[PDB]
Amino acid sequence: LKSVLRELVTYLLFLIVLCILTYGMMSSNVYYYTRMMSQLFLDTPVSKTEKTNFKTLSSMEDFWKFTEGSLLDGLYWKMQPSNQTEADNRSFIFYENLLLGVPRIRQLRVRNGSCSIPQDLRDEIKECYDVYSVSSEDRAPFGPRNGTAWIYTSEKDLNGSSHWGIIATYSGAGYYLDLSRTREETAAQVASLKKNVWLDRGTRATFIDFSVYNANINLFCVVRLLVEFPATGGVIPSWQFQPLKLIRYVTTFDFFLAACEIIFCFFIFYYVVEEILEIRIHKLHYFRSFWNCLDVVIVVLSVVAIGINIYRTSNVEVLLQFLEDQNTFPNFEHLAYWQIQFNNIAAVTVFFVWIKLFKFINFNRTMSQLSTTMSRCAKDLFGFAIMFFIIFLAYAQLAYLVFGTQVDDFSTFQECIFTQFRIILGDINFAEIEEANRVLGPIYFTTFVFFMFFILLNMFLAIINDTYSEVKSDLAQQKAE
Amino acid sequence: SVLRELVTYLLFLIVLCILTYGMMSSNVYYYTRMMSQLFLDTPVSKTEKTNFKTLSSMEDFWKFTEGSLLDGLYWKMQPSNQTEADNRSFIFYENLLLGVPRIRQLRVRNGSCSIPQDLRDEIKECYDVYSVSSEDRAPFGPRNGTAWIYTSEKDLNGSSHWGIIATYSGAGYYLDLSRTREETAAQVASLKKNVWLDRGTRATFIDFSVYNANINLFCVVRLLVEFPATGGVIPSWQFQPLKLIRYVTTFDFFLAACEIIFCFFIFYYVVEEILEIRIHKLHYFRSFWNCLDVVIVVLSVVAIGINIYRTSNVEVLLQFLEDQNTFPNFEHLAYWQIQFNNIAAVTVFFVWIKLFKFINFNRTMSQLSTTMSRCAKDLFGFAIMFFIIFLAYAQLAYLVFGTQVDDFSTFQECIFTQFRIILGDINFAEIEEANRVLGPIYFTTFVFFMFFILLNMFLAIINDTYSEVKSDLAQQKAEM
Amino acid sequence: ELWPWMAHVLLPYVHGNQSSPELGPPRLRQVRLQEALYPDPPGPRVHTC
């Protein structure tokens, strides 16, 4: 077993290297930036005369004024007296120069007149701005149609992937405006167009975005936010954090940041060598289900992370110029989604690798016996669950038919099922159950407790003990041949 | 082959399930809950916080009759609150009355019990607990009408009730109330003036019914207040919704076809059973599935007979909907509806259990079934001993804590309390203070002996049986 | 609210009238930290310090 031992050692070393690379991918110097972007950027008081939070809006006019003040303040950096002070000089890397050229904030309107009011309700309910919906989306921009900020068109300039959240996917029907220089039209002209009430009865949700522009590696970071306009004024906000940078590396300190990862991928190439030889030569269509519960997914376990890294490093760095020049503004339709998908894939791969290492940490006899015990009885253990669920559903149906009229716990079938599960875990009421039916009420409870607990909770452990003892005896009889 | 019987059983199960889902309907629970909130939770008066659920005196009961009862029985659908251009979720109980409610009382006579002669110079009145032989059948007070004259059960079309304390007969002193509030209140005030609830009264029933006019289901309401011989008040209630109007749309006509199919299936099962019992293995009751189909057949026959009885008695309800000058006696309909619901639930449970016969195909399920059937005699034999010890402990608890706990007030209550103790749902705050000695000893010995010894033995029996069955089934294979 | 509690239940308890053997007068030592505390901004009612 010298070759097997060497292969196991090599696999363990490769897994350790992959785990080290995954940990390095979560390097430092980003927690502080994320905290600054989440607690200071897009979240700060408008001035020193108010105590409201960023998302503490309660009135339409107050919300509009606070949003205008926050946009005016955040579009420019601090004083930082260390330059000629041309236009909002920035000397920090903490959510300060979070402007990145011309901004693009949209405001989707709320359709009015979803349904007719009651006939007897005359001159009472005439204008009714319906909730934000995409099935009845209406193009309702400002009356003075002039410029890009006075239009209501499709999502050709929205750049949104999907929401699939509380209501529906995000709707791009709105007015996408542009921001001039900091001291040109972004310091004392936000409210100059107050004739058209932005926070009127004809708005649904305001979508805004904020970049970083304060990162050494290409300054590639932009987050988004959406504040739903309530029917009574104010705005309820929802957003996330998207702090990141490029994948630029300096050989002085970051020479091996990802150089070995390709070598780690070479290990997968080694698994490729046995990939086409362990199936078409020996054990054809045999070790696929009863033994390949983890070997099959091991080959493609790290493929997702490598593909994500390749697509995010060698495919997005070409267009990372970010040359705004007050005339260009690229959105974050794909950057945020790609970052979220890469983070999720990395977390899933890390969890899978940890599970696989714990399985490989079972080189001792006890953990190997435990792993073998639960694998030799999976079919029986799953088969017993069928009988358990059949009896459980029969009792649930009986309880629903009997007590499903006068007891709040058995009002509906799901309530009956949840009540029975709670009864299993020592949460019996028995107060209204007994009084709902003096006969056939206690009978149900007593028979349920007796049968379920004793018989089935003992069948479970009987199966487990039988398979465990069988594994122990099988390993014991192997000695002294 | 068994495939045909499998198909027939699945068809029967589908028919039964669709019939039960159809008859279950919906929003009946909400109607019952709104009835309970309207008639039980509202205070008797704005100056008191005592609702009907917490009655504690005769004067409180009198206050309830003119208070929460009337304020909630006569068009309490008043949309005087902030209703949104229509009746809100709470207010959907316009609840037109079906005639007049009825009030009735049951009382005993002075001298039903004999006081000792030592105290005879100090006490003059002795009223016994309620019993048929000790009931009073004499006029009292202003003996002028039906409220002060005894009427037999036959003349009143009553029946037993089986209340909380005793089982009350159908006779008593009764009064039929009126239609309008301002005259029913006057009648009740006249009843209160000339004292109507003396020391000899033992029970009081109030009965009425409603229709709600918009969801098409009647509702029968009964309220009982019983005064024990030891002083006090014990209230109880019964709300039963009914739906006998079963021909409105095309949906409920499908249920007639389902009932016809069920009748055909029951006839087929009956004829199959009677043919197989005779020719093949007379007295074949050795097996389990042989003794399980008989139960299903009998229960289904009882259910269809009860349904036929209900359908026949439906006509007794419809002939007076525009007449509101007589008390509608709907008690039998509600009782038989409850019986039908119980029978249907039990037969559905047994039909679902019968499915275990068919899932015995592969080795795993067959092995599990064989293990389950092998550990049946041993489990019953040990359950005999387990229940002997359980009943001994329950009787000891009944004798010790039977008067001052309320969880061990009755023997069945002791059994259910012990079963809940196995679940760890004990209070133990009242057990210790009821009896500082012999109280904790009960709890400690019961917990220790019960859990450790008896649960371990129950587990061990099944474990040994499963091991033996697996070993036997492994040995019988690869040895021929 | 500390002052009404101290005036109602504390002072009659420490002094009393032939009751509550005290064995040493009470004390009210406090720490200052010499900084104005920032009121908690509205939100999810964070349970931190």
Ligand SMILES: *[C@@H]1O[C@H](CO)[C@@H](O)[C@H](O)[C@H]1NC(C)=O
């Ligand atoms: C009850 O009956 C006894 C029997 O003699 C009598 O002395 C007593 O006055 C009676 N009391 C009432 C209230 O009728």
Ligand SMILES: *[C@@H]1O[C@H](CO)[C@@H](O)[C@H](O)[C@H]1NC(C)=O
């Ligand atoms: C008793 O007689 C009639 C009932 O039949 C009733 O109208 C009358 O007012 C009653 N008399 C008294 C004194 O209550």
Ligand SMILES: *[C@@H]1O[C@H](CO)[C@@H](O)[C@H](O)[C@H]1NC(C)=O
């Ligand atoms: C009892 O039933 C008979 C049947 O005809 C009826 O006449 C009588 O009025 C009923 N009893 C009462 C109190 O209504």
Ligand SMILES: [Ca+2]
């Ligand atoms: Ca049969």
